[PDB]
Amino acid sequence: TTIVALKYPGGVVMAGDRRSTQGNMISGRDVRKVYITDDYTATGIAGTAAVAVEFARLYAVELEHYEKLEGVPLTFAGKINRLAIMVRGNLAAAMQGLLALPLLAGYDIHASDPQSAGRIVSFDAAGGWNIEEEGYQAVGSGSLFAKSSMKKLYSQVTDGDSGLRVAVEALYDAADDDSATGGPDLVRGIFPTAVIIDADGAVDVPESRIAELARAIIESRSG
Amino acid sequence: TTIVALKYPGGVVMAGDRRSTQGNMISGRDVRKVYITDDYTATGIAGTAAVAVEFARLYAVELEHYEKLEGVPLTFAGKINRLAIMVRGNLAAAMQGLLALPLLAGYDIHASDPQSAGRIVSFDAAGGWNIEEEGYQAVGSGSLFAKSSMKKLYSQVTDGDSGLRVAVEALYDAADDDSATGGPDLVRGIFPTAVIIDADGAVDVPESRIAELARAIIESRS
Amino acid sequence: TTIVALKYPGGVVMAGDRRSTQGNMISGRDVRKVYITDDYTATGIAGTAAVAVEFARLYAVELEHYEKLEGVPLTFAGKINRLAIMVRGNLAAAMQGLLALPLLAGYDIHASDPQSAGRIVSFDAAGGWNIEEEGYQAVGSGSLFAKSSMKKLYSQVTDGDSGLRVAVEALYDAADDDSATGGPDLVRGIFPTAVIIDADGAVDVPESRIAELARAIIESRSGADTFGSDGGEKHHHHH
Amino acid sequence: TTIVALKYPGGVVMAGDRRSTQGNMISGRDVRKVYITDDYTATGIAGTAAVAVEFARLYAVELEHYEKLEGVPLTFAGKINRLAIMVRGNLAAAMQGLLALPLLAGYDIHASDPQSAGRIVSFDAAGGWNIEEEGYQAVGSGSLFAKSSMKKLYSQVTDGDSGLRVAVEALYDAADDDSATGGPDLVRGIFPTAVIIDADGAVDVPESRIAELARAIIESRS
Amino acid sequence: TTIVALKYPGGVVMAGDRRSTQGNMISGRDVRKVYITDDYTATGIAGTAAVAVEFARLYAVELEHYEKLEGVPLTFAGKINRLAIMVRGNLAAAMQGLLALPLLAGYDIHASDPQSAGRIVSFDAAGGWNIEEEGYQAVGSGSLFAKSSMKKLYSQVTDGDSGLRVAVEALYDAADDDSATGGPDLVRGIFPTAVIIDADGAVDVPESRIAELARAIIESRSG
Amino acid sequence: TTIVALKYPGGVVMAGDRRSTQGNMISGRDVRKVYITDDYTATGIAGTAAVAVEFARLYAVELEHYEKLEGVPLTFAGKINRLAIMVRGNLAAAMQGLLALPLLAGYDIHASDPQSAGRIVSFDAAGGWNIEEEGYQAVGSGSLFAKSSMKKLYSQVTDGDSGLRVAVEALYDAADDDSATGGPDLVRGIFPTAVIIDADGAVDVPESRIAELARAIIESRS
Amino acid sequence: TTIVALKYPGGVVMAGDRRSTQGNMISGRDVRKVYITDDYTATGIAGTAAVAVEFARLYAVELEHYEKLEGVPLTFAGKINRLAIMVRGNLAAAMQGLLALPLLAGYDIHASDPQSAGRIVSFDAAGGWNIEEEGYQAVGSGSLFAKSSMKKLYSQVTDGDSGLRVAVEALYDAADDDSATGGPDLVRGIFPTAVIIDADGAVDVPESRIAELARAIIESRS
Amino acid sequence: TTIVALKYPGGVVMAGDRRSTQGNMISGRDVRKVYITDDYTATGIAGTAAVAVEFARLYAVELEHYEKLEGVPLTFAGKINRLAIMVRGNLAAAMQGLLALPLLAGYDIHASDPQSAGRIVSFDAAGGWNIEEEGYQAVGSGSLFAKSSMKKLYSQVTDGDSGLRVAVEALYDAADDDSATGGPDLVRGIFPTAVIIDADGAVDVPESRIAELARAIIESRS
Ligand SMILES: *C(=O)[C@]1([C@@H](O)[C@@H]2C=CCCC2)NC(=O)[C@H](CC)[C@]1(C)O
Ligand SMILES: *C(=O)[C@]1([C@@H](O)[C@@H]2C=CCCC2)NC(=O)[C@H](CC)[C@]1(C)O
Ligand SMILES: *C(=O)[C@]1([C@@H](O)[C@@H]2C=CCCC2)NC(=O)[C@H](CC)[C@]1(C)O
Ligand SMILES: *C(=O)[C@]1([C@@H](O)[C@@H]2C=CCCC2)NC(=O)[C@H](CC)[C@]1(C)O
Ligand SMILES: *C(=O)[C@]1([C@@H](O)[C@@H]2C=CCCC2)NC(=O)[C@H](CC)[C@]1(C)O
Ligand SMILES: *C(=O)[C@]1([C@@H](O)[C@@H]2C=CCCC2)NC(=O)[C@H](CC)[C@]1(C)O
Ligand SMILES: *C(=O)[C@]1([C@@H](O)[C@@H]2C=CCCC2)NC(=O)[C@H](CC)[C@]1(C)O
Ligand SMILES: *C(=O)[C@]1([C@@H](O)[C@@H]2C=CCCC2)NC(=O)[C@H](CC)[C@]1(C)O
Numbered sequence A, E: 001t002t003i004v005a006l007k008y009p010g011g012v013v014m015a016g017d018r019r020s021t022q023g024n025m026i027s028g029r030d031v032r033k034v035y036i037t038d039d040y041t042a043t044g045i046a047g048t049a050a051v052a053v054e055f056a057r058l059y060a061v062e063l064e065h066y067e068k069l070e071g072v073p074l075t076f077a078g079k080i081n082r083l084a085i086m087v088r089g090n091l092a093a094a095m096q097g098l099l100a101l102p103l104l105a106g107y108d109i110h111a112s113d114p115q116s117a118g119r120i121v122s123f124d125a126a127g128g129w130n131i132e133e134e135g136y137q138a139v140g141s142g143s144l145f146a147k148s149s150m151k152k153l154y155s156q157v158t159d160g161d162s163g164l165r166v167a168v169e170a171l172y173d174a175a176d177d178d179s180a181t182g183g184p185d186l187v188r189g190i191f192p193t194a195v196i197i198d199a200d201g202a203v204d205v206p207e208s209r210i211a212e213l214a215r216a217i218i219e220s221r222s223g
Numbered sequence B, D, F, G, H: 001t002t003i004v005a006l007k008y009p010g011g012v013v014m015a016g017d018r019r020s021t022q023g024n025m026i027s028g029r030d031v032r033k034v035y036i037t038d039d040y041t042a043t044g045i046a047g048t049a050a051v052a053v054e055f056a057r058l059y060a061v062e063l064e065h066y067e068k069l070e071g072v073p074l075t076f077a078g079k080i081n082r083l084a085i086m087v088r089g090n091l092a093a094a095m096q097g098l099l100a101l102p103l104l105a106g107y108d109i110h111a112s113d114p115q116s117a118g119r120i121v122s123f124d125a126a127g128g129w130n131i132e133e134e135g136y137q138a139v140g141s142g143s144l145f146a147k148s149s150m151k152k153l154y155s156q157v158t159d160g161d162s163g164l165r166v167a168v169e170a171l172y173d174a175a176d177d178d179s180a181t182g183g184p185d186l187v188r189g190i191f192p193t194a195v196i197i198d199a200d201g202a203v204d205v206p207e208s209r210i211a212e213l214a215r216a217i218i219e220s221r222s
Numbered sequence C: 001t002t003i004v005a006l007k008y009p010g011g012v013v014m015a016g017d018r019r020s021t022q023g024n025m026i027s028g029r030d031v032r033k034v035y036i037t038d039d040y041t042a043t044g045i046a047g048t049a050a051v052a053v054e055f056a057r058l059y060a061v062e063l064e065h066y067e068k069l070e071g072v073p074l075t076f077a078g079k080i081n082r083l084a085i086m087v088r089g090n091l092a093a094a095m096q097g098l099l100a101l102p103l104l105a106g107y108d109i110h111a112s113d114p115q116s117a118g119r120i121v122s123f124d125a126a127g128g129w130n131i132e133e134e135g136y137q138a139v140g141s142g143s144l145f146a147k148s149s150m151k152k153l154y155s156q157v158t159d160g161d162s163g164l165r166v167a168v169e170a171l172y173d174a175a176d177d178d179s180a181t182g183g184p185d186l187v188r189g190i191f192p193t194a195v196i197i198d199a200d201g202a203v204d205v206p207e208s209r210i211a212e213l214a215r216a217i218i219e220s221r222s223g224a225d226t227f228g229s230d231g232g233e234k235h236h237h238h239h
Helices: A049-070 A076-089 A091-095 A143-156 A160-177 A207-221 B049-070 B076-089 B091-098 B143-156 B160-177 B207-221 C049-070 C076-089 C091-098 C143-156 C160-177 C207-227 D049-070 D076-089 D091-095 D143-156 D160-177 D207-221 E049-070 E076-089 E091-098 E143-156 E160-177 E207-222 F049-070 F076-089 F091-098 F143-156 F160-177 F207-221 G049-070 G076-089 G091-095 G143-156 G160-177 G207-221 H049-070 H076-089 H091-095 H143-156 H160-177 H207-221
Strands: A003-008 A011-016 A020-022 A025-028 A034-038 A041-047 A100-107 A118-123 A129-131 A136-139 A193-198 A201-204 B003-008 B011-016 B020-022 B025-028 B034-038 B041-047 B100-107 B118-123 B129-131 B136-139 B193-198 B201-204 C003-008 C011-016 C020-022 C025-028 C034-038 C041-047 C100-107 C118-123 C129-131 C136-139 C193-198 C201-204 D003-008 D011-016 D020-022 D025-028 D034-038 D041-047 D100-107 D118-123 D129-131 D136-139 D193-198 D201-204 E003-008 E011-016 E020-022 E025-028 E034-038 E041-047 E100-107 E118-123 E129-131 E136-139 E193-198 E201-204 F003-008 F011-016 F020-022 F025-028 F034-038 F041-047 F100-107 F118-123 F129-131 F136-139 F193-198 F201-204 G003-008 G011-016 G020-022 G025-028 G034-038 G041-047 G100-107 G118-123 G129-131 G136-139 G193-198 G201-204 H003-008 H011-016 H020-022 H025-028 H034-038 H041-047 H100-107 H118-123 H129-131 H136-139 H193-198 H201-204
Touching: A003 A041, A003 A100, A003 A118, A003 A143, A003 A160, A011 A034, A011 A041, A011 A100, A011 A118, A011 A160, A025 B160, A034 A049, A034 A193, A034 A201, A041 A049, A041 A136, A041 A193, A049 A076, A049 A100, A076 A091, A076 A100, A076 A118, A076 A129, A100 A136, A100 A193, A118 A136, A136 A143, A136 A160, A143 A160, A143 F143, A143 F160, A160 A193, A160 A207, A160 B025, A160 F143, A193 A207, B003 B041, B003 B100, B003 B118, B003 B143, B003 B160, B011 B034, B011 B041, B011 B100, B011 B118, B011 B160, B034 B049, B034 B193, B034 B201, B041 B049, B041 B136, B041 B193, B049 B076, B049 B091, B049 B100, B076 B091, B076 B100, B076 B118, B076 B129, B100 B136, B100 B193, B100 B201, B118 B136, B136 B143, B136 B160, B143 B160, B143 C143, B143 C160, B160 B193, B160 B207, B160 C143, B193 B207, C003 C041, C003 C100, C003 C118, C003 C143, C003 C160, C011 C034, C011 C041, C011 C100, C011 C118, C011 C160, C025 D160, C034 C049, C034 C193, C034 C201, C041 C049, C041 C136, C041 C193, C049 C076, C049 C091, C049 C100, C076 C091, C076 C100, C076 C118, C076 C129, C100 C136, C100 C193, C118 C136, C136 C143, C136 C160, C143 C160, C160 C193, C160 C207, C160 D025, C193 C207, D003 D041, D003 D100, D003 D118, D003 D143, D003 D160, D011 D034, D011 D041, D011 D100, D011 D118, D011 D160, D034 D049, D034 D193, D034 D201, D041 D049, D041 D136, D041 D193, D049 D076, D049 D100, D076 D091, D076 D100, D076 D118, D076 D129, D100 D136, D100 D193, D118 D136, D136 D143, D136 D160, D143 D160, D160 D193, D160 D207, D193 D207, E003 E041, E003 E100, E003 E118, E003 E143, E003 E160, E011 E034, E011 E041, E011 E100, E011 E118, E011 E160, E025 F160, E034 E049, E034 E193, E034 E201, E041 E049, E041 E136, E041 E193, E049 E076, E049 E091, E049 E100, E076 E091, E076 E100, E076 E118, E076 E129, E100 E136, E100 E193, E118 E136, E136 E143, E136 E160, E143 E160, E143 H143, E143 H160, E160 E193, E160 E207, E160 F025, E160 H143, E193 E207, F003 F041, F003 F100, F003 F118, F003 F143, F003 F160, F011 F034, F011 F041, F011 F100, F011 F118, F011 F160, F034 F049, F034 F193, F034 F201, F041 F049, F041 F136, F041 F193, F049 F076, F049 F091, F049 F100, F076 F091, F076 F100, F076 F118, F076 F129, F100 F136, F100 F193, F118 F136, F136 F143, F136 F160, F143 F160, F160 F193, F160 F207, F193 F207, G003 G041, G003 G100, G003 G118, G003 G143, G003 G160, G011 G034, G011 G041, G011 G100, G011 G118, G011 G160, G025 H160, G034 G049, G034 G193, G034 G201, G041 G049, G041 G136, G041 G193, G049 G076, G049 G100, G076 G091, G076 G100, G076 G118, G076 G129, G100 G136, G100 G193, G118 G136, G136 G143, G136 G160, G143 G160, G160 G193, G160 G207, G160 H025, G193 G207, H003 H041, H003 H100, H003 H118, H003 H143, H003 H160, H011 H034, H011 H041, H011 H100, H011 H118, H011 H160, H034 H049, H034 H193, H034 H201, H041 H049, H041 H136, H041 H193, H049 H076, H049 H100, H076 H091, H076 H100, H076 H118, H076 H129, H100 H136, H100 H193, H118 H136, H136 H143, H136 H160, H143 H160, H160 H193, H160 H207, H193 H207
Parallel strands: none
Antiparallel strands: A003 A011, A003 A136, A011 A193, A020 A025, A034 A041, A041 A100, A100 A118, A118 A129, A193 A201, B003 B011, B003 B136, B011 B193, B020 B025, B034 B041, B041 B100, B100 B118, B118 B129, B193 B201, C003 C011, C003 C136, C011 C193, C020 C025, C034 C041, C041 C100, C100 C118, C118 C129, C193 C201, D003 D011, D003 D136, D011 D193, D020 D025, D034 D041, D041 D100, D100 D118, D118 D129, D193 D201, E003 E011, E003 E136, E011 E193, E020 E025, E034 E041, E041 E100, E100 E118, E118 E129, E193 E201, F003 F011, F003 F136, F011 F193, F020 F025, F034 F041, F041 F100, F100 F118, F118 F129, F193 F201, G003 G011, G003 G136, G011 G193, G020 G025, G034 G041, G041 G100, G100 G118, G118 G129, G193 G201, H003 H011, H003 H136, H011 H193, H020 H025, H034 H041, H041 H100, H100 H118, H118 H129, H193 H201
16 A cells, blocks of 8 residues: 655645555455545545545544534644544554554645645554655555655655656555555556645546556656 | 466466565566476476575476486476475475475476377475376466466467467466566566477577567457 | 355346355355345355354344334445444454455445446455445455456356356356355255346346256356367366 | 275275365365275375375385385285384374375285185374274265265175275265365266275276266266 | 753753654654743653653643643642653553653742752653752653763853753764764754743744754864 | 665676664764675675674685686676575574675676676575666665665666766665664765776775765755 | 661661662662651652652651541551551552552650650561561661661660661661662762651751761771 | 773773672672783673683683794784684573673784774674774673763873773763762772783783772762
8 A cells, every 4th residue: 555645835635556455465456545534634544444444434524523513624733633533542453453544635724824835744553643844755565665756756846736746656656666555557547546635625636637647657667 | 476387289388477575565577487497397486586496496407417317317207206305305494484386397208199298297385296187287376366367268278379378368367466476567578487398398488479468468458 | 155246237146155164064055145135235245154144134134224214225335334334343253253254235226327336345354345346246265266257257247147147157166166165066956046136126036047057057167178178188088 | 085995795995086175275176096006905095195195105115115125025914014104104294284194905815715805904193003894994084974974885885896886975975075075076077086906906997987886876866 | 862951050951853763764854852831841752752742732731721720830849740640641551662751841930049940850651750950861762872971061051052052962962872863954954952941931942043053063073 | 774786887886884783872883884705796785793794704705715726716696606505504593683685796707798797686584696687776774765766866877977976875865764874974074885896897986986976965955 | 779767765767878770770869768757757668769759748648638637646556557558559560560668667656665666667568567676677679788787786876876877887888789779979979868756756867967977987997 | 890992092991890790789899801811902891700701711812822823923803803703602602691792902013003003893792893993982781871971081082091091980980870880999999900002012000090090080070
């Protein structure tokens, strides 16, 4: 698994691979690992699928629940805290192998400066969180490969589209070096999924845009 | 890893993938796992990379050693026995994680009927061997996928070329389902290696022929 | 054990073998592993026999329970969630050798496009589920053999009968390679069971069509075996 | 695995199934488990395949080795003792999972009464042996089913052919109840192998004869 | 990690490095480990990030909670006891690898002599506390190097400014000998954080001030 | 520790960091980890220092020993085999926490094409070796960061100087992400060491050249 | 750690060292280990710092709590029992390494004979207590050294001042032989603390008096 | 234990504390840990006393043995290697708890520049050695304190006497923070021992010079 997230001027993008495995066996090729959790946030999760999925589903319900009860959404800091508490609650199970780690991306409508209102937050198994300041982050078995790739490509990020391209290329580098991360599948037409979030909210990136970027990356390296 | 071998009218073909890993990490993309061990035999090995390479190397030396000392090569049965003894000798080390399992393919110049002189032999960790009679075999983490694929494609094998095509497609199916087996890499131009053996001896299959077959398999599935 | 499920234009079919074992011993030859759980869904279970039967029985009760209480059946997504929660609830027991894994097949009456309303969903021990979209799935010790077989035969599925045939052939290939899966028993007349589900609902497939399909698969392999050889050599002859 | 042996008036018959497995997986369908070890004896072996084959191969060499060195074959009791010593020698390996148990069938040319010169001997992991006196014996995971079947069918053995039939039916019952034992495979035409030994020596039973008995048992149960 | 604290005439200073690691990997470069917990106290924490952060957050809430309920802030001794009880409460978890150890610095408004009203308190895993009487203390994997450095530099601490400079140099020595403690990062412009507390209260030291001190220390040792 | 090696047109460069640690403690700042082992080869080693230093020293003696005894140096393949055998010989100790892994760089004087005569070989704990074909390799705790960095920078390598620059930058990237790898120390004036090998032999890269490259990388990133 | 207590005509004195350690490291030099727990009692504690401090603090609160609620202080026997019960309550934690052992010294206002109203009570991990009647006692890693020293010096105790001198010299002897007990630190001017208790109540001994005695002991041994 | 060594213009000095312990108990106050091992070298050892003494004794014999046999002393590099091999030989025992680590100080008569001919070499449990390049080193439980102290005082070393003073002060700081290292004992008149080595050879520093330095350090800190 590999999930990446990066900030660009005016927003944030999060993308994830489609592979699921059982030991060495490829058991899934179209899993979606990045979810829009509310109008301004997306959650990507690595680790045990059952827990990962529950986290994303319960977390979206909890965010909207607060909103309906209180009339206003939680502040970004409050959203982070709720995710952290949810991860912390799974600590015992995690020690027993049901370990799941989310990566949170969002756009803070209340931030002072809009161009930098993008947010990336990582979490550890005990519920510790860290608001990323370096511009990008990644979780999963291919995360180190992805991060070392973004380290070299990040300077090319100037807007949402160059942001998305660097994210897809980082996932491509993760797949190139980590057999547990799925690369673009040209035969079946399956590609990484991605969410972009800016002042207008969180939106799924259309598969055809990702397909085009992936094919370009492949062609480019083919020579 | 996946190494396959299958028999076709007049000979045998053995093909192997190119991937090496360390845990989930892809650590190699061009490893050669199939070796010509003498004029009429090829060995493909799965398992611990260090042990596999050493088995193939020592085994070829042992075969030629006998030939130079005695003036004639070992009978095919003798070749099988030496490889089995070599595997048996690694049993202790294997239980400690140094396990390697070879797959042997050959053409028996002394067999009565030439069209069926092809031989495929598999081995277990204790040195047990079995001369295959169903037409094909495979070893490695992708072997079950490869064998289930060849079970459906084998009736198409009628000569060396259709044999080669089915072998490459079996490796393609193994890579499709086993993350530890490498599929054809069109970006880097790296494909499975293969050896064909018939009455004229063992010869490495040129990469261009495999690339061709691989692209046709991919085109067909898209 | 092997349970398979596959989608065909307009529906879905699920079929299961009949073997039960205790170690190497064959302890049962007529176990039924595929259940109609409601009018539009079937459940096939692999693993610990005791837990498997209980999951199917309790799940059917839970689906009907909701229907009687609320006046309407659960949406397909809700059916999936309930089965996932039930599996998750057995996680402790499963880590202690009581593990069971279900495979769910259904027809979604509320799906937009009827020809593809067929649904196949797999589950892992922790309750994780995945709606299958490659057309087929299988669970049990013979599942890898069944899936590799279906991978090569799936392009032949064009309707319910060809789908049934392919499912039976996949079970046949699983039994051919997995000693824990039972093949067709011609001496006793026992064959895999199957359920077909389409817009008119889930129905058990009659034993006689499955028996016919099975003998046809066997005669066909018998013929191919004689036609074939080992790179030219034939080591056995039928007599 | 299931190997059976039974005495009939004037000789003995030994038959074995063809299945090899690795966990639940069927890894082989034509394995031969019964060997003619010398002119008057056959050995069938169950357990670890590597070791089983070595035993049979080494044992035949040892019997013929004695014969060439001393000019005469070992007495039947001496043949038993050598086999026992070979099994005992594998005891450490066996406790480590490489356990193989042979079943020995023979015809004693030096026995006083020819009609009963047939011999069946079983062995345990420590090298203990027992000359069977009840008429039949079996080894392997399906042995209990085979023995209970022979217990009911043994009164039908009156000569070599009815003995061969009972042995095949015992293997059929073992496969019917033990998933590790292979039944007759009508699709592939593969059947249990058998060896018959009488005053004229040990001979392999032709496959066609076993196929016919197998079909009659199946028809009869159908 | 290294957190240092030292008393100077009239107050106290606490400074912390910015590194977070996962095994040998540097996983963070801008973590803040020193928090102002109330108007007159600061808490620096080493160990498990998740527990560390939760300690500081809950501790700040608990101190203000008492103040709002009772109308007056807790005495300094009461503040120490509350932190000790919180640490003790994590002992079972700590034995499971979730260990966190705080270092408390404060200014006691009720102390008789103002020049020495500065306070430094250390804590062990069982909730034991000790009010430091030798002028400085440190916690974390680089604490012994920091303390041995302050032992030689402490006589130079005559006021809050030289106290801040020494604190920075002790952290510099900790980073020089402990790979788990981060040194000043001149390329990215990231430096240790610090808090100064005197009769006017606790205040964050501006990063620019720390950067100047760090550059000066670096120039000096260069020759 | 991080040691990197990369091929450039006409040769090869190997560079290593200078840090040694004991747990979290920095215990050394000027360790040299890259050695010229003969006129055309360099060895860099990661792992337990006592064993690493021993391996480089013993290996250079072995290479020269052969040369003096036989009158000619070992072929490159033979040099690889000797290093592999030495590593294999330490396996028991390595499972005991004494593990050391070398990285070998060389220039093959007997290679057909001089521009590509550069060689990079990696080794695993069991003595398995692999001649690298992707152009670069790295060993040590910072190796993955270094390899990911070189993957993006490798296309800039057109000669020995750009090759050296990319190697230093890879080490810089390794130190930026791995606390166990030492970055350039501007205060003390200590920098990574490097060896360049081309048709004229292996020569140590002067510290001043490395220092200029390091400063340029630092200025570039700030 | 070392805490000593001894009876003198008319009262009792308790004194403790100032060292705290973490393994071999000296982590503290001014810890106070002897507390006045009520007007007529002092408690000194050895073992886990966290537990010892909590024992002294909770115990003082419990004694005064009883006094305020009931209007009169607990009898000396009651005070002993409360401390024993508190120690017993820590048993589980103590078996887990959180072990602390108190030493209690007091003056019993209700005793018949005032010259001997001094009391010293020791405690074990399970809450067992013992009223010491031999004149002195000590707890901590240096206690055996302190007791053997007091055994030889005790006959010199004739009043409060000589009692104080013997206590300080016993702590001196403990520090002389036990690296975990701190000696008088002349450089920093830190000395053992002490509490004296007689008919007028418990009072802290001024540091200057202890420093004086310590200097005299050192002069004497020089 | 703490043993320090530092280079000064023209030579080197090595000094060690005098304490030996058994658990928390001080079991010795006058142990000598620094030995002159030949005319130009001194060895200081920490760890298990039995093994430490054996090392110093055996090593001095080995150095002189070579000299008598070959007519010339070993080069400094050879002396290092011999000590390393001796340490490596104790690795199995060290794992079992008999761990001893030497620190080597010497003056290399064959060095090009005399003012810097001083040498300091440290060793790890596996026999790994490192020629110190930053001016000083220390071994033992108080070594980190001693090194952090020398890091601040080293710029004061300008000759043999200031180097000896700084070495004594570093040992004083080690004793101040490590209960296992002995400080100057003014009551008994026992101080750290030291060896100075320059072009004229290794000589023991007279106790009176060390006593004066120690008393001055103590008064200074008072
Ligand atoms: C990824 O972390 C991975 C996925 O299978 C899993 C599936 C769906 C969404 C959550 C992530 N988890 C694992 O355990 C695999 C094995 C290493 C995986 C492919 O990495
Ligand atoms: C295959 O068996 C595999 C290869 O890495 C290895 C490399 C070279 C030749 C021998 C075979 N061995 C392993 O351990 C991997 C993980 C399961 C592998 C990719 O399958
Ligand atoms: C299959 O999964 C299998 C069946 O015995 C069992 C029986 C009835 C319904 C649920 C499935 N379960 C087992 O434990 C056997 C051994 C691996 C089995 C035949 O596979
Ligand atoms: C039988 O004993 C069996 C055979 O696989 C084996 C193969 C060839 C000749 C010797 C016997 N051994 C096993 O381990 C299997 C599983 C228990 C087996 C099928 O019973
Ligand atoms: C420090 O103690 C350290 C920090 O990562 C951690 C991070 C943020 C605030 C609390 C302290 N904790 C650890 O576990 C690391 C291990 C080497 C650390 C760098 O020392
Ligand atoms: C590197 O591999 C490293 C070095 O300390 C060591 C020292 C000198 C030359 C050989 C390599 N070895 C280790 O054990 C450290 C910790 C993982 C190290 C810094 O990486
Ligand atoms: C003494 O018992 C000792 C002290 O550190 C401790 C500190 C303050 C008051 C209670 C006693 N406790 C220990 O664990 C040390 C090690 C043996 C100690 C110095 O003896
Ligand atoms: C020091 O290393 C130490 C000494 O007792 C010992 C004695 C004589 C010369 C060799 C060194 N070794 C130990 O085991 C003690 C306790 C940890 C010691 C005081 O440190």
